[model samples]
Target: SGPVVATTKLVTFLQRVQHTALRSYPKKQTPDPKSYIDLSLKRPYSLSTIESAFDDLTSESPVPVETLEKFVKEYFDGAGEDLLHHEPVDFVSDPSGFLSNVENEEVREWAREVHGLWRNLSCRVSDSVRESADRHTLLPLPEPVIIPGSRFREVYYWDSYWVIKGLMTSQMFTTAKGLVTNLMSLVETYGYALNGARAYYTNRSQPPLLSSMVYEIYNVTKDEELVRKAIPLLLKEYEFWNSGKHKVVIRDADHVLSRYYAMWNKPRPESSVFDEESASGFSTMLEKQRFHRDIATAAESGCDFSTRWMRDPPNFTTMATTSVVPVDLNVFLLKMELDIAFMMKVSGDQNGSDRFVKASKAREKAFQTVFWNEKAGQWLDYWLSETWKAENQNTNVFASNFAPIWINSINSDENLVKKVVTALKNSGLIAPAGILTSLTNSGQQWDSPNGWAPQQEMIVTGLGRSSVKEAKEMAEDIARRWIKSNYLVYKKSGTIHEKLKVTELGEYGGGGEYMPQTGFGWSNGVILAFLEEYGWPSHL
Candidate 1:
C-alpha cells in the first residue's frame, strides 16, 4: 500500500550514482548495478549529505572511477555489509547422526556437507543498521535470516519455505522457526511478506508461501503457539493476495484468481540501469512505465525475466505478467487455504476452519472449470484480454502446468492423480538432472537448462505422497537424478549452485543478470528434503 524505495528520492539519487559508475568504470569484475543500491549510509551521514556529495560528481561528465570510488567510500559502507554473517543458534556440525535415512556412505557424506551450508548462508542486520534503519534499505528482522546467496543478500519469501524444510530435515527446528518468525515480522509491517527483505521490495511480494512455511514447521515441531501467532497474520496475507490489483475475475468460471501485480511502475532500484535500457525501444513514458511494471510483477513471481511471462517467445518487451492468471499462484493459494484450515482445526476453531475449507473447495472447483484442460491433461495458465475476457489458455509445457499435483486434495484423489501422473510422464519436462522450468530454451534463468530447486521439490514431493505406486516411483526417480547432479557438481566445484543445468547432469546453470551463484539456500534445502523423503540406497 505504501510507496517502494524505487519511488524514493534516495534511490533516485543512487540510480544516478550507479549510471555514473557504469560509464566511468571499466567492466572488469567491478560491482554490478545492484551493488550501488545495496550500499548503506556510513555513520554520521544523512540522505541529504549523500545526495549533496553526488551532485558535485554529477555536475561534470565522465566522472573518473577514482573520484566516484572516493565519493562512495566517503558516504557509504560496502555493498551487502549491512547484514553481517550470523551463526544460527541451532546449528551443529554433525547434529548427532543427522540424515540417518541415507544408506550409501558416499551419498550420506555429501548430504552432511549440504546440511553444513546453513551456516554459510545465515545472516542478520548489523547493529548500526538496526539503530539507523532509514540509512539503509536492508530491513531489520527479529530473527537471524538465511539468504539465497551470491548477490541475493536478503531473506526472500518463497525461497525460505524450502529453506525451512531443509532446516527441519537437519533437525534445526529452532532455526526453522526463526526463519518463519522473520517472515511474519515482514507480514506485520507490509500487510504481506515482501519479495525480499529490502525497502525497495516493499511494493510487491514474491509468491505467497508464508502459510506453507508455518504449516511445515508446525507439522514437525507441533508448536501450537506458532500457529496461534500465525493464524491471524495468514488471514491478513490471504486478503492481501485475494483483493485489490492482485485479484482477477475470469469470465469462464466467474470466479476470482490471483496474478502477480506490482504497485510501482518505475525501474526496480536494484536493476535501474538495465531496466531503463530494456525500455529503450518504447517511445512513450506510458509505454516504458507499463514495461517496468510488468518487469517488477515478474520479480514478484520470483521467476524474474522468464519466457513464460512473455507474449512472444523469448521477447522481453512482451511480458504481460499482469494479464495472465498463473496456475501455480492459484495452487499456492489453494494450499494456503488448506494449510490455514488445518491449523484452525488443530486450534479448535471449528467455524474458522470450516470457512477456509469452503474457500479451498471453491478455488479447487475454479481450477477444474477454468484452468484444467482435459485434452492437455494439465492445468494451463489463462490469458486475459484488455476487457478482462478470457483470451485463451497459454498451453505451454511449463513446470507450472503440473503444479496442481502439489495440492493434497488433487493428488490424493486416485482418479485425478492417475491423469496428472500420465500427463507429467509425457510432458517432456523431466530432464536429465531435474524438471525444467519451461520447455523453451529462452536463455532466461527460469527457462530450460535451468531447473530450479523449488519446482523439483513440489513435483517430486507431490508424486511421492500420492496413493499411486507409479507416481511414487516417478518421484523417487526425479529425486535421484536431481540429487546426482547436485552431488556431482558440488564434488567437482566444491560449492553448491543456485540452479542446475537439467538438460545435462553435473552442469550448473547460467543466464540472467548475474554469474552462476553458490552457497545457494534453496538448492541445498531441496537436496536435503529429497533425501529425507526417499532414502539413498547402495545401488544408485
Candidate 2:
C-alpha cells in the first residue's frame, strides 16, 4: 500500500511544521478529544503521542462497561470463564511468560519502590540517642508519615511493633532499633507510651509489646545497655496498666484493676447530665451493639484489631461502653511485669525485683480467676456487666488467648495447654490461609477469617511455649501457611496487601473505602520476619 496520507487536521499541521520548528514548539498542553482522534489516525508517531492516544481510547471507549457486564453474565450463568486469565503475571516465574511481562516487571519495580518508601518514611534517631548514658534523655522519636491526605494522622504505639518487625525483615535494623528506643523513650518520657504519639492516642494503649520489642532489639544488637535501659521502661509500662498512675480502678488484693472503667480521666456519658441515669442504662445497650459494630467495621476496613474511635480524645471512657478491657492488653502487662522484675533482680534491684514478683503473682491470680474458664478450658474474654459482675463466656476473642503462651500465664500442665491448643484450632479461629482475628462466620468478624500480624506473632510465640509437641507443630504449620500466602501474593502482585484471604490464596480480603492499603508496613514486616525464622518456601 502507498504511504498513509494524513487526513486529520492535527496530523496535517504536524506534517507541515518543519522538524526544527516542531522541536521548538511546546508540546500540546490541552487534552483535546479531536487531537487524540487525529493522533490515533496517524500510524507512525512519537511514543508519548501513541501512549496519549491509547489512554484516550481506553477512557472514551465502553470497554470496561462491556467487559463488566459480560463478566457478571458469565459468573451468574456458570460460564466458567478463567478468572486467572486476567491475573497479574507472577514475578518469580523461571522464564517470563506472556501475561504482561513488561507490566510484571513494572509491578516488581513498583514493589521495590514502595519497599524503599517504607524504609525511607520510617523515623530514625540521632546518634545521640543511640549513645546516650541517660536513656530517658528527651530525644524526638521519628514522626509518622501521614498517608497522604489520610485521617490516620498519628504514630500508633503497638502498630509499630509489627511495622518495626517488617522493617527488620527489610534489614532496616537501625530503623527498627530506633523504633524500639522511641517506644522506650516514650515510657521514659511519659509514664507509658500513650495509645499513640498524639493527643488523640491517649484513650488506650494497645497490647504492650515494649518488652517484646526490647527483647527483639537485644537479640539483634546484644547491647547490655539497651536491655538495662529498657528494663525500667518496661516496669513503668506495667505500672501504667495496673492503676499506678490514675485511680481508674482500685487495685484489689489480686492486684488487678477492679471497678475497671474506660476513659480514665475523660468525661463520659455516665458523668454527663445528658448521659447520666438514662445514659448508664443506654450504655449497656450501646456497649453490646457498639462493640459488635466496631468489630465488624474494623474487619470490613481491614484494620485487624487496631480500630479506634479516632474522632474523640485519648481517654478510656469515650471508647464507647462496648469497648471492653481487652484480654491481650492485660496478659501482655502481666508477662512484662514478671519479666521486668526478673531482670531487676539480675541487675541487683532486689526490692524492685521483689515488688514485681509480688505484683505479677497477684495479677496472675486475678487473670486465672476472671479470664480462665476451667469448664470450657479456653481463656474467654471478660467484660463488666451493668451490675459490674465479671461476665465470662463472651465471644470477644481479645487476641489474648495467645497471652498464655507469650507470657507463660498458664500452669505448666501439658494436658491443659493441649486442651487450650485444641480449643484454638477447633474454634475455627485458625483458618488454613491464616489465623483469623475471630472464628469464621461469626457474622462478627473479630472471631473469623481476619488475621493480623500482632495476633499471629502471639499465637506463634504462645504455641512455641506449649509443652505439647503437637501444639508446637500446629503453631509452626499456621505460621507457615500464613507466610506462604503472603509470599505467594508478593510474588504474584508484587504489592503487599493489608490483609489476605484466609480461605483462598488467589482471593483478597481487605476491601475498604480507602485505597486498599497497599504497601502496608506491618504486613510486609511480619511476613518477612516469619519467613526469616521459618525459611520461606519456593512460591513457584
Candidate 3:
C-alpha cells in the first residue's frame, strides 16, 4: 500500500553507481558503500534523469571520476541531506539536578559532556523530504529523531528504547515522545516498523522495541493519550510478529514463539555490493538466495554478522538466523505483551488488558518449556531444522542468554533469580569493562569483546531491581565498569562509540560492515541512565 522507494530499478541503478564510483574514484581508503545509496535526488531531478546521465557516462566503460563526480554534483544531494539538523527544544546545557548523585566532580563533568551529545545527534526529516519523499531513501517521519550517528542517519527500531531511557534521564520528555511517535507512524504505514526509516528497511524489522519505547515514555509522563494511540498499533505489531514467517511452534503444538525472518531474499540494497561479494563463493543460486535471506534476517535481529546467528563459528556463510529462535526476540515479545496489557489497562480497556495478560502468561510458559535450560541455568536459543520438528538448543553463552534477567516477571522469582545470577557469574562472559556479547571471538561486531549499550542496560537494570542482595551489588559493579569504560574512551576520543571492547578498558570496538562510529545514540543513553541510577562516588 505504501510507495516502494527502494524499487528494483532504484537499487539496481544504485548498485551500478556504487560499483562505478568505487572504480572511478579510487582512494587509499575506500568510501563507505552505503554513502552512495544514502544520497537523495536533488530538487527538480529524477531517478530516470540520473539513470540517463549514468548511461551517457557508461560509454566510458569504467566511468571517469571527473565526469561521474560532476554528474553526482548535478543530480544528487550528499548522504544525509534529507534530514536537517534539529536542535532538541527540550535540551538545556545543564539540566537542573541532572546526575546529582555523582559525587566525583570529574566524573560529573564527563557525564555532562555525554549528556550534551544529544544535541549533536538530534535531527528531523528535511522539509524537502516531506515535499518529495519519493526522491529520498530516508522515509519522511512526522517528528524529529535522534539518530545513532555517523553512518546511521535515520531513526532505528530497537535503539530508540535506550535512547528514550537516556532522554528521560536528561528530562527531555517531549523529545522522547517524538521518538516514540515516529516509530508508531512506521507501524501505521507498514503494518510494522521497519528496521530503520528507509525504503530498503521495509522488508524487515529490528527487535520489536516500539512498545518498549512507548512504555518507557508513558511510565515517565503517564500520557494516557499516548497509551490510547499506541495500544491499537501494538496489537497490529503483535499480530505481525506472531503470525506468518516470524512465528515458530515447538514441543506441544499449542505453544508458539517467534524468530527473525526477513521478507526479502536478496542482497540488501544498502549493502548490496558486500552481500554480492559474500555470496560469490556459494555454488548454487538457491544457496546464495538462502544466504542472502539469513543475512537480512541477521540485520533484522539488530546483531548483524554475529557469531550467535551463524551455524559455523567465524564463517559468514553459515548465517542461518531464520532457523534460530532467539532468546532476546521472544523476551521482547513477552515484554511487549506485558507492556500492551499495562497500556490497555491505563486506557480503561479491562477486557483488552485481560486478553494480553493471558497472552503473556502463555508466552511465559512457552519460555519455561522451550527456552529455559535447566543444566546451564540460562535461557538458550532453540534451533529448528528444515521441518521445525526438533527441539535443538544452542547452549552458547551470549548476552541474550542473560536477557531474561532483564525482565521483571522472569527475574522476580526468588528461585529463578538465584540460579540465573549464579549461572551468569560463573559463565565467564563478564569482563573488566562490561558484559561481552558472546564468548566466541568471531571478529564480528556482536561477538566477544564488543559490549553494546542495550545489553548492559537490560541486564544491569534487570538485576538492579531484583530482590537479591548479591544481584543488586553485581548490577552496580557492572554499571560502574561500563560507565568507566564509556567515560574513559570518551575522555580520550571526545565522542561516544557505537560499541566498545568489553575485554579492554578505554578501547573502542571495531570489526563490522563499517568503520568505528561516533555520536552513538544508545551508548550515550545508557551512560546517562546508569549515572542517574547508580551515582558515581569520589573515591571510585
Candidate 4:
C-alpha cells in the first residue's frame, strides 16, 4: 500500500517517508539536466533521510523551501559519491585488433584508444545505491558492463548488441560473455530487461535483442551450457511479447505478431520529459493519452519519434506506434523464435525444438504476407487495425526494411532477395555516406542525413550473408562509406558520435531532446567490427 520503486532500489523512495518526495523534489535543487531521474532513483538515500534533513518535510503546511532545497542538495551529494558504470567483469584482455592503413592511421588510432573509453563509462550498481534493489524481482548485475557516454548512463538494450559485437572483435570474449550474463540476469529477475538498469523503465523496454546477443556470444564461445541456460529466459521474453496487450491478431489472417507498446499510458519517467510536457496541449484526454503512449512505444523501438510510426508520415503528433506492426519488430521476433529453436535442439529438447520451429516458421510466413507489398516489391510497415493496409504516406522505407536479410529471411528466396536488393539500391535509400534512415530530411535524428551505429552494422552484415552478388557489393560499399563518414567526423571532432549527421546541419535540423553524443559505445563497436573485416578487405 505504499511507494514501490521499479525493480531497482536506487530508483525509488521508501514508502513510509515518500509522501511527497517525488513531487516536491521535482521543484527542488536540481541535478544535471541530461542525467535523468532514473539514474538517481537507484541512489542510497531514502525518504526517511529526507525527513531527517528537513525540519518541515512537506507533512507540515508551511513548506520550508530552504530546508527542502537543503535535502535535495544533500541527496545529490550522497549520490555523487561513486561514478556511473557497471563494474567491469573479473577478466580483462588486451584489445589489439583492427589497425587501419597508413592513410587511415589517425582513425585507426581512435579505434585503439576508444576501447579504453569504456572504463570511464563503466559503473557498478551496488548496495550503497539503495536497499530496494534487494528484492528477488531485481538483482544488480554482478559483473562489469559498459554504457554509452554522456546522457546515457546505464546499460541499454539494443545498444549492448553492438557493444558486444565490438567487444568480441577486440578479443574481449569474457567481458562480452559477462555482459550477456548480466542481461540474462535482468531478464531472470524482471520478467524482461527494462529499457535500462533504472527502475523507472520497468513498464517499458528497448528493442528485443537479447536473443540476438545470445547468438553473438555463442558464436564466439561454443558454450553449450550457456545455450541450455538461455532457452528458458528466451521463452520468458517470448511470452513477454506474446501477452495479450503486446500480441495482436489480424482479422484477415489467423496470425499473432509483436509490436512496440509500453504498459503505462504516460511519458517515460527516465526518458524525454519535455516531449511529455508539450503533449499536455492535446484537447481530449484520449488524444493526450494516445500521444504519450505512442511516444513510449517509440522509445521501446529505440526510434522514439520517427515518421515510420506515424499515421501521417513525419508528423510526431500523428504517431500511432501501438497501432502499427513494424516490419523490423516482427523480423526480430522471427529470428528470436528460430534462435530459441536452435538452442532447444542443442539442449536435447526435441519436443520444445519442434514447437519453436513451428512458431518461427509460422511467424515468417505470416510476416511475409502482412508486411510484403507485392506491388511495391518491398516490405512496409502496416497499420495495426487493418494489417492489410500499408501506410502509403510513409514511403521512405527506412533501412530497417532490409533487416530480414540479416537473418536470412530472404536467403533461400532468391527471386525475393534479388528484388529486395534492387529496391534497396534504387530506392533513394542510399546516401553518399551509407544509407540514410529514410528519405525525409525532416530534422528528426532518426530521419534522413543521420546514420546510427546499430543500423549501419545490421544493414551491412545482413546483406553480406545474402547469396546475391549485388547484395554483397552493396554491403561493402555501405560499410566503406559509413566508415568514411565516421572517419571524417572523427578527424574533425577527435571523437566518435552516437549518430552521424551524414549531411551538413544547415540542410536539416536534427530533432531529439539532446544534441548528438560522443564517447559513444555502439559507434566504437560497429566501426571496429567494420574496420576489422573491411579495413583491409584483401588481407585474407
Per-residue alpha-carbon lDDT of candidate 1 for residues 1-540, written as tens digits (9 for 90 to 100): 323334456566778888888888777745688888888888798898888778876897488788889999999998888889988888988877688878998898889889988998988889876787887878888988999998888889999999988998899998889889999999998799999998788889988999999998888879999999999999999999999888888755268789889988888889887888889999999888888888999999889878889999789889888777899999999999999999999999999999999999989988998889898889999887723333488888999898999998888888888898898889989889989898888878999878999999999988887899999999999999999999889989999999999999999998887788898999999999999888888776
On the 0 to 100 scale, the lDDT of residue 18 in model 3 is 84
lDDT by residue (tens digit), candidate 4, 315-349: 67887888777788888888888888888887889
Which lDDT values do the candidates have, in the order given?
0.87, 0.49, 0.88, 0.68
Model 2: per-residue Cα lDDT over 220-329, one tens digit each: 77777877888867867666666532222313322354221223321211111212222243346645334333322222222333323211322222333233444555
**Which regions of candidate 1 are displaced past 4 Å?**
1-8, 27-30, 386-391
lDDT of 1 at 366: 86
On TM-score, the stronger of 3 and 4 is 3
Comparing 2 and 4 by lDDT, which wins?
4
* Backbone clash numbers for all candidates listed: 0, 17, 0, 13
Instruction: Flag regions of model 2 displaced more than 4 Å.
Output: 1-154, 166-171, 202-204, 244-255, 258-323, 386-391, 395-399, 409-412, 440-447, 511-515, 537-540
- In candidate 3, what residue range of length 10 has the lowest lDDT sum? 1-10
TM-score of 1: 0.97
TM-scores, each model vs. reference: 0.97, 0.61, 0.96, 0.85
Error of 1 at 501 (Å): 0.6
